[PDB]
């Protein structure tokens, strides 16, 4: 480019060097010898630029595994639990939820007796976090909640971006 | 219960129970009947993409779910801008969209800004800035987010020959699984206790450029005549 | 070759629900890009 | 410009949208005309969602050299799209006869073309301007 | 030619609900633009 | 429910003659093992971030 | 070698629910990277 | 790089040293 070249050639001249942009041609004015010098500089700064093809390769391989299993216990008549936080949901919220889900009856004698169905919102709140097998085995009012899961994950990713650039030039992609 | 699946058995069974018709009795002998709402069941089913089938056997309701999502996309757009040598040209087919900062007008779309200069014969040098954008909703973000793929480089192309500026080749395989574990290991009955979610994505982008040098008027008339 | 070995092992026990040719695997060192097996098969016909 | 001024937040400002052509010719002392041209075709689109209206804008501003009475193509776009999508059970949707019962297919094909041409004409004599004005009138 | 091969394969198993000539496919290398098959057929008549 | 939510372990209520003895016992055994090694390839005297 | 000793001891009494080859253990000093035992077994076959 | 080299060479010269960036070539002018 004339603009780059005129700047460079100022020093060689030290004569006037003026860059005509639209034609990309530069106007030299000097004596004969300096002219023959700057034409030999321009001749060697005018060379063709090779151009590189930059091809990146990105490899991201993830893998994951886990096994979460344990047995919990509970008795809500006299509240006694064997309870764990490792598990998805704890026996406390599960038994409480199951009791709230039962149909409750409210009696007023003298002989009114009303019946009403309970909400599942506590049980729904307890089960929403379960990833796995949560199985309640009720034996003699002791409800043992078994929970077990194996989460096996994997990921494989190749993306390679290639940008083609003139030498010494910069490229964004 | 599994999270890989569209909807989990918990919300589905809860929804089905809420949908049943409930009766409320007060004896002495009043008995009222009322129909339940579907809003929980509707909230559970809204996310299902696929087959979700509830097989009720002995109060144990097994919810099977299976789907195969096969997608494809194919896009060619080529924008050509005709320029005087050493002159610069912008080209945009797209839209100006405002963006907070206050606010400002930013252009998104297919845009090509090129500044050629011609080797005194044949090869053309190109300072090129090329973008393909579009507006995406902000989730969640303070303002809309532009999907933008651009490359701005400097290449030297022969007169009438094509040259590849850029590209991307992307491939993904995401497998996921859940199981009891032990029961899900059995070959025949294992598929009853497993939830598998597999996905394969693939993408290709090439950006090519073909200059053509117009010197005579008969060349410009020859090109304009065929594009016309 | 370490990663390529990992990926070949990923291709031996593959995606259970999908075809094992869909898992990305690096080409053998220095060979650049290869068409899929099915696509490659198609190309030879034409 | 044939279009409309529409206000846009920034405060606010008046921005013009429509068909607009801003040209600065200079004439080679015969025939060919050089054109510094800025050409836009816009229109106002509602903001969804955005802080303010969004202009659909297609413009090209370049510099060309056109012969006297001949047409020359400034710009263009040729866009083609095919978006196919599908969903199925999978296994039941594979059967040839009954598969269409379990499948949901959404296919789409879009196509678009834009060419922008320019024809100058040099008016020197008064009889030429009268000849053009007479036919456009 | 890699992408062109991919697209030709897209045209062999085509859009199920639409005509297979509607899928965009690159022209053979160096040949620039081609009219659609139907449009091309129309052009020759006129 | 507010009282039991914090139990990690065995909390067992043995009720004897209106005196309820609550036994609680737990053994929490944890472990962690982590290797990550990042390698950055650099020109001499040049700096690299990773 | 102190840490490597700790990790080998972690591998002798291993993960109870998972295979003992999944616990990360430093390679012997100076040997750089090793393939997993199963992956290594696979590699020799091919 | 020419930019680094021209800066370094200023002192050695003390003649004009000019760095041409795009070709990554530097132009020396001095006696023999």
Q: What is the DSSP string of C1-26?
A: -HHHHHHHHHHHS--SSS-GGGS--P
Alpha carbons A72 and A84: distance in angstroms, whole number = 7
Q: Which residues of G touch A152 (CB under 8 A)?
A: none
Residue A48: list chain B partners with CB under 8 A: 156
Residue A4 tokens read as 């780059």
Return the SS3 of B104: strand
Of F7, F13, F15, the CB nearest to A83: F7
Question: Does the distance separating the beta carbons of C26 and A154 come in below 8 Å?
Answer: no
Those residues whose C-beta lies under 8 Å from the C-beta of residue D100, and which sit 6 or more positions away, are none
Interface of A with B in 21-50 (CB under 8 A): 21-24, 48-49
Beta strands, E only, D89-137: 104-118
Per-residue H/E/C for chain G:
CHHHHHHHHHHHCCCCCCCHHHCCCCCCCCCCCCCCHHHHHHHHHC
Taking the C-alpha atoms of residue A80 and residue D49, their distance in angstroms, rounded to an integer, is 55
Q: Can you tell me the distance from the alpha carbon of A134 to that of A144, in angstroms, rounded to the nearest whole number? A: 10
- Interatomic CA distance for residues A8 and B143, integer angstroms: 46
Residue B19 and residue B38 in contact, taking contact as beta carbons nearer than 8 Å: yes
- By Cβ distance, the residue of B51, B81, B102 closest to D62 is B81
For an interface test with C, the pick among A53, A57, A156, A158 (most C C-beta atoms closer than 10 Å) comes out as A156
Per-residue tokens: D27 = 């004439």
How many CA atoms are closer than 13 Å to the CA of A147, on its beta-carbon side?
23
Element (H, E) at A123: helix A121-127
State the method. Answer: cryo-EM
Residue E9, chain C, CB below 8 Å: the answer is: yes
- Cα A149–chain centre separation: 25
Residue of chain C minimizing CA distance to G45: C9
Distance CA A103, CA G27 (A): 62
B interface test, pick of A1, A19, A103, A149 with most B CB neighbours within 10 Å: A149
- Give A156→chain C minimum CA distance, Å: 7
- Smallest CA-to-CA distance from A146 within A94, A104, A76, A80 is with A94
CB contact under 8 A, A45 and H29: no
Contacts of C13 in chain G (CB under 8 A): none
Nearest-angstrom CA–CA distance, G4 and E22:
63
Provide the shortest C-alpha distance from residue A58 to chain F (in Å): 14
Mark whether E and B touch (3+ CB pairs within 8 Å): yes
**Cα torsion for B7, B13, B18, B20, to the nearest 10°?**
120
Whether D86 and B69 lie within 8 Å, measured CB to CB: yes
Q: Do chains B and A touch (3 or more CB pairs under 8 A)?
A: yes
What span, in angstroms and rounded, lies between the C-alpha atoms of B12 and B45? 8
Cβ neighbour number for residue B67 with a 10 Å cutoff:
18
Resolution, given in Å to one decimal, reads 3.3
CA dist., res. A166 & res. B59, Å (int)? 71
Measured between beta carbons, the chain C residues lying within 8 angstroms of G42 are 8-9, 12
With tokens 């998972």, the residue in question is G18
- Distance, in Å, from the CA atom of B14 to the CA atom of B181, rounded to the nearest integer, reads 26
Largest alpha-carbon pair distance within chain C?
36
The alpha carbon of F39 is separated from its chain's Cα centroid by a whole number of angstroms, namely: 31
Task: Determine if the peptide bond prior to B23 is cis (ω within 30°).
Answer: no
Q: How many Cβ pairs closer than 8 A exist between chain A and C?
A: 15
Q: Tell me the torsion sign for CA atoms G26, G32, G38, G39.
A: positive
Residue D84 with chain E: CB contacts under 8 Å: 15-16
| Cα distance between residue D59 and residue B109, in whole Å | 11
Return the CA Rg of chain G.
12
Q: Which residues of B touch D54 (CB under 8 A)?
A: 95-98, 135
Say yes or no: B76 contacts chain D, CB-CB below 8 A.
yes
* Angle, helix C2-12 to helix G37-45, in steps of 10 degrees: 80
Report whether C23 contacts C14 (CB < 8 A). Answer: yes
Query: Residue B108 in contact with residue B95, Cβ under 8 Å?
Result: yes
Residues of chain C contacting G35 with CB distance shorter than 8 Å: 2, 5
User: Quick one: which of F35, B3, B51, C2 has its CA closest to A153?
Assistant: B3
Asked if residues A167 and A49 have their Cβ atoms less than 8 Å apart, the reply is yes
- D23 - beta bridge partners? D37
Asked if residues A75 and A142 have their Cβ atoms less than 8 Å apart, the reply is yes
Which H or E element spans position D91? helix D91-94
Q: How far apart (Å, rounded) are the C-alpha atoms in residues D16 and E40?
A: 41
Residue A19 belongs to domain spanning? 1-48
Rounded CA separation C17/C24 (Å): 15
Looking up tokens 């509602």 gives: D46
Q: Are B144 and B113 in contact (CB under 8 A)?
A: no
Please state, in angstroms and rounded to a whole number, the distance separating the CA atoms of residues B17 and B38: 9
CA end-to-end distance (rounded Å), chain C: 34
Do chains F and A touch, with touching meaning 3 or more CB–CB pairs less than 8 Å apart? Answer: yes
Tokens of B217: 């008027």
Axis-axis angle for helices C37-45, E2-12 (nearest 10): 80
Q: Which of B67, B68, B14, B72 is nearest to B42 (CA)?
A: B14
Choose, out of D30, D40, D75, the residue to mutate when testing the contact with B (most B CBs < 10 Å): D75
Residues of C whose CB is below 8 A from E8: 42, 46
CA of A148: how far to CAs of A105, A136, B10, E12, in Å?
Answer: 36, 12, 17, 48
Instruction: Measure CB to CB from residue C12 to each of G33, G35, G42 and give the nearest one.
Output: G42
Work out the widest C-alpha separation in chain A, in whole angstroms: 130
């Amino acid at each position: 480019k004339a603009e780059d070249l005129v700047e460079v050639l100022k020093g060689v001249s030290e004569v006037m060097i003026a860059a005509h942009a639209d034609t990309n041609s530069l106007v030299l004015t000097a004596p004969q010898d300096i002219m023959n010098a700057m034409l030999e500089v321009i001749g060697q700064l005018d060379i063709r630029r090779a151009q590189v093809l930059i091809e990146a390769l990105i490899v991201e391989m993830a893998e994951g595994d886990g096994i979460n299993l344990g047995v919990q216990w509970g008795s809500l008549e006299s509240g006694s639990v064997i309870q764990y936080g490792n598990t998805g949901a704890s026996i406390g919220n599960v038994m409480i939820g199951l009791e709230e889900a039962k149909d409750t009856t409210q009696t007023k004698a003298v002989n009114e007796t009303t019946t009403t169905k309970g909400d599942y919102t506590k049980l729904a709140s307890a089960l929403s976090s379960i990833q796995g097998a949560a199985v309640s085995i009720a034996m003699g009012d002791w409800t043992a909640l078994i929970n077990a899961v194996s989460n096996d994950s994997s990921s494989n990713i190749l993306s390679s971006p290639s940008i083609t650039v003139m030498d010494n030039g910069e490229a964004s992609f | 219960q599994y999270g890989n699946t569209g909807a989990s058995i918990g919300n589905v069974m809860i929804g089905l129970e809420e949908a049943k018709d409930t009766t409320q009795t007060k004896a002495v002998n009043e008995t009222t009947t009322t129909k339940g709402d579907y809003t929980k069941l509707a909230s559970a089913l809204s996310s299902i993409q696929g087959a979700a089938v509830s097989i009720a056997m002995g109060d144990w309701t097994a919810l099977i779910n299976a789907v195969s999502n096969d997608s494809s996309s194919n896009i060619l757009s080529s924008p050509s801008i005709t320029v005087m040598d050493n002159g610069e040209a912008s080209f945009i087919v797209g839209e100006e969209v405002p963006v907070i900062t206050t606010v400002d007008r930013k252009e998104v779309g297919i845009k090509l800004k090129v500044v050629p200069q011609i080797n005194e014969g044949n090869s053309v040098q190109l300072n090129i800035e090329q973008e393909v954008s579009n507006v995406l909703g902000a989730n969640g973000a303070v303002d809309v987010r532009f999907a933008k793929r651009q490359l701005n480089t400097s290449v030297m192309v022969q007169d009438g020959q094509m040259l590849v500026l850029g590209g991307l080749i992307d491939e993904r395989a995401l497998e996921s699984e859940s199981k009891v574990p032990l029961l899900g290991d059995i070959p025949l009955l294992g598929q009853l206790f497993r939830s598998t979610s597999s996905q394969v994505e693939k993408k290709n982008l090439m950006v090519f450029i073909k200059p053509t040098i117009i010197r005579d008027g008969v060349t410009a008339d020859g090109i304009t005549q065929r594009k016309y | 070759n370490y990663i390529r070995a990992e990926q070949l092992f990923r291709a031996e026990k593959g995606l259970r629900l999908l075809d094992d040719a869909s898992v990305p695997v690096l080409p053998k060192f220095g060979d650049d890009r290869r068409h899929s097996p099915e696509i490659q098969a198609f190309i030879e016909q034409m």
